Amino acid sequence: ELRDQQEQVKEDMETKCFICGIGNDYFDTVPHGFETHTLQEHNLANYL
Amino acid sequence: ELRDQQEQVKEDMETKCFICGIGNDYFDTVPHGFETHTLQEHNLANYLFFLMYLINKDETEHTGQESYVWKMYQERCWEFFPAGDCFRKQYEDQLN
Amino acid sequence: VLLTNLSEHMPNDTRLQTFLELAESVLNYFQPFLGRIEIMGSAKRIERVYFEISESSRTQWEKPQVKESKRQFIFDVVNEGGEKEKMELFVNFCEDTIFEMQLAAQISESSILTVRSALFALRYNILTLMRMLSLKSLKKQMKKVKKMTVKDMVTAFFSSYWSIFMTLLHFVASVFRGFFRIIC
Amino acid sequence: FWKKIIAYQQKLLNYFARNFYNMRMLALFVAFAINFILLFYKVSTIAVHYVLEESSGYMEPTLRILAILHTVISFFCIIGYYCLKVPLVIFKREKEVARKLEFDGLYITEQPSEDDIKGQWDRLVINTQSFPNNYWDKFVKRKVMDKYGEFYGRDRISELLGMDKAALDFSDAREKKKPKKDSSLSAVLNSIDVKYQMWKLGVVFTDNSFLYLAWYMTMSVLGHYNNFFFAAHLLDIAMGFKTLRTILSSVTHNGKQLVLTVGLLAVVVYLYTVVAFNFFRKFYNKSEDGDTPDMKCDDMLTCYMFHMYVGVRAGGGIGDEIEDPAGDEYEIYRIIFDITFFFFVIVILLAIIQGLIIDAFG
Amino acid sequence: TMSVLGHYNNFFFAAHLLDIAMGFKTLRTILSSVTHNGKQLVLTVGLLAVVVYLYTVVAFNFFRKFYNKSEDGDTPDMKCDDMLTCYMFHMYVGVRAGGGIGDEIEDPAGDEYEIYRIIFDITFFFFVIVILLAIIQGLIIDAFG
Ligand SMILES: Nc1ncnc2c1ncn2[C@@H]1O[C@H](COP(=O)(O)OP(=O)(O)OP(=O)(O)O)[C@@H](O)[C@H]1O
Ligand SMILES: Nc1ncnc2c1ncn2[C@@H]1O[C@H](COP(=O)(O)OP(=O)(O)OP(=O)(O)O)[C@@H](O)[C@H]1O
Ligand SMILES: [Zn+2]
Ligand SMILES: [Zn+2]
Secondary structure, eight states: OHHHHHHHHHHHHHHBOTTTOOBHHHHHTSTTHHHHIIIIISOHHHHO | OHHHHHHHHHHHHHHBOTTTOOBHHHHHTSTTHHHHIIIIISOHHHHHHHHHHHHHSOSTTOOHHHHHHHHHHHTTOTTSSOSSOOHHHHTHHHHO | OHHHHHHHHOSSOHHHHHHHHHSHHHHHHHTTTEEEEEEEOTTSOEEEEEEEOOHHHHHHHHSHHHHHHHHHHHHHHHHTOOSTTHHHHHHHHHHHHHHHHHHHHHHSOOOHHHHHHHHHHHHHHHHHHHHHHTTOOHHHHHHHHHSOOHHHHHHHHHHHHHHHHHHHHHHHHHHHHHHHHHHO | OHHHHHHHHHHHHHHHHHTTTHHHHHHHHHHHHHHHHGGGEEEEOOOOEEEEOOSSSOHHHHHHHHHHHHHHHHHHHHHHHHHHTHHHHHHHHHHHHHHHHHSSOTTTTSOOOSSOHHHHHTHHHHSOTTOSSSSSOTTHHHHHHHHHHHHHOHHHHHHHHTOOHHHHHHHHSOOOOOOOOTTOHHHHHHHSOHHHHHHHHHHHHHOHHHHHHHHHHHHHHHHHHSGGGGGGGGGGHHHHOSHHHHHHHHHHTTHHHHHHHHHHHHHHHHHHHHHHHHHOOTTOBOOSSTTSOOBSSSSHHHHHHHIIIIITTSSSOGGGTSOOOTTSTTHHHHHHHHHHHIIIIIIIIHHHHHHHHHHHHO | OHHHHHHHSGGGGGGGGGGHHHHOSHHHHHHHHHHTTHHHHHHHHHHHHHHHHHHHHHHHHHOOTTOBOOSSTTSOOBSSSBHHHHHHHIIIIITTSSSOGGGTSOOOTTSTTHHHHHHHHHHHIIIIIIIIHHHHHHHHHHHHO
């Protein structure tokens, strides 16, 4: 259960954006869209 | 965990293309589209053979595309690799 | 390469199709040696590049150890490899695999007894079974069959199947005897 | 005569084919009955003879009747198999032979590996005149001839397939009439296809399920010479009940892994045997009276036997069995030896066995 | 009825402690871990009885001089002369023993059937003690999962 919870957290972060909640594919329609969005547009560190 | 990792790798390969990253359903809109795309259009073995071809082939004899890829490879700038797009997506309306 | 380029750039052109029926033979010969990849060209456009795949390179890639290396690389780049560096790891793998392929191509330069025993046992044991049928003595056996009997019919059926099982046991015994003989 | 004997034979065929399975764990019911009677079996008294105890007083004739009934039901199960399940096996084999003869030309373009038992044995059925007897496609010989006629030679193809070259054209032409009647027993014997029956029997003999049922026959028959052979028929529950099949698949799913783990355990214990045979030999005495000692590690084969028989089975390990090391120059060395034995063999490897079974379940 | 009979004998009130399974739903998860695969557990116990009975047949036929259990050698207590007794012995002492039946039965050193009996004991240990009990644990763990 602990390992599955770790996997759940990891895949949640890799599939959805933490703030907006949009899937990774929509951003990935533009190359590198997901990490660009989650590191520049919707960075939780930036919100903090 | 080892068995789940094996399953993860297998289903990743069966659902997405290794290079482009597009799901299998979009290709499967045309029959046998996924395996056709992953064995002809976006074959990783084909990319490896192309790198071998550029390395062995002389620089002066390079065509325009070959020179482009050679320069971007020598500067280690991986954008000739298609990400999020394919020939099918680019010519969706035009080709079919 | 010219014909393939034209064919892929026109999905629907009857004339070019007709030239394709004129030229399967060359195309079928050159199918193993024609490579096809898609790249993002300088025009912000995805283009297909056709190149030469050599026979030696194909064989070296189809060597089993290279496939084990491919499986290991995929396992790694899927499980611990990240999205950002995936296609840097892929190029590193391609470079190393190309080097090992070139080295291998450079260096590479210029049961039945058991099966035979099983066939012999089957042939002999089933021929022994066929000898009884080929005896032409069923006419003599018609002595008690001409006097029709349900018991006679049942006994004949059961005896035939029992003789089949007898033959199977003889086959197994002959197989074991041939086994002990053939190792010895 | 010929009109009715075959009909009654087919009646028997149909009855056995219908009743095959019922006659199959009827056999299991009889097997549990015989084995329940066998629990009342006592040794009493040179030759020692076994006497079946019976409070009722007639258990011996009942056991004999049950043994005869079992050896009859097993034979009826053999017949039921050969009536019901073997036509499907032959239909399979024929469809694969036809579809490798056509699409791969397994006997025209290329040749069998000579390491394939069925690949070599099927060479006979090509030339039979009763081919696709079970398979629906009756045109496979002509399809292969159309596919390979021009290149490999029509004469070669027809001689391989048994097609009558000089006679097919004549059959198209004027046909001669011959008096033939089913009432002629010699004509029936000429009509039967000897080679096709030979090939069929070979396939049946190579069949796995038929061999299992033949073993079931032989065990039941030998049970009359010795009654305890009927206990081996209790092994049939694995196939009789599919409920037990899940539990047994939990083991057999990782069977190769289990076998390799047992081999690795033998290698590790052999390494420990090497270490003990070299340095720890004065600790393996097993005698009770000190006058004559029974040294279990003076000969290394005996030492290895000891390590895999008593050491592995012991809960604590080899140290629970071997002597105590207190007050000896190699005390700490032997403590490390024993602790590593316990942790690697008893704890980890058996944990690997349990992990394999649990992972198979999951 | 149990509560009423508890007046005639006070110990019948101990059976009411079985009510915790339904009283507490916290225990219900632990008990469902067992009862979820109850049919599988029952079939595994039956299969264990069949396997041990096969071993009993083998021992009753070939290994009978090794099942003496007496302390003084004047009168021996032979536990496998009658096969019902031998089966009782195999499922009572043999299965419960950690090493298997060999930890209980006599030692085979210096006998014509030494290797045969070693194979017998090792197979008993590996099939019964190791695998089947591992099947029980695996069923419980799989039920949890
Ligand atoms: N709103 C978001 N902010 C940051 N990352 C996000 C967001 N939504 C999705 N992600 C994804 O979650 C991933 C994990 O981010 P994070 O940096 O917290 O992970 P980490 O590996 O624990 O940390 P780090 O590598 O910075 O030490 C990111 O790489 C990104 O792809
Ligand atoms: N870019 C890609 N290149 C190759 N295969 C891909 C790609 N994207 C997805 N796949 C899928 O991954 C599957 C696995 O390919 P691969 O040939 O490496 O697997 P394998 O079974 O290990 O190898 P093989 O059968 O060739 O020995 C392919 O059949 C295909 O469906
Ligand atoms: Zn977002
Ligand atoms: Zn792709």
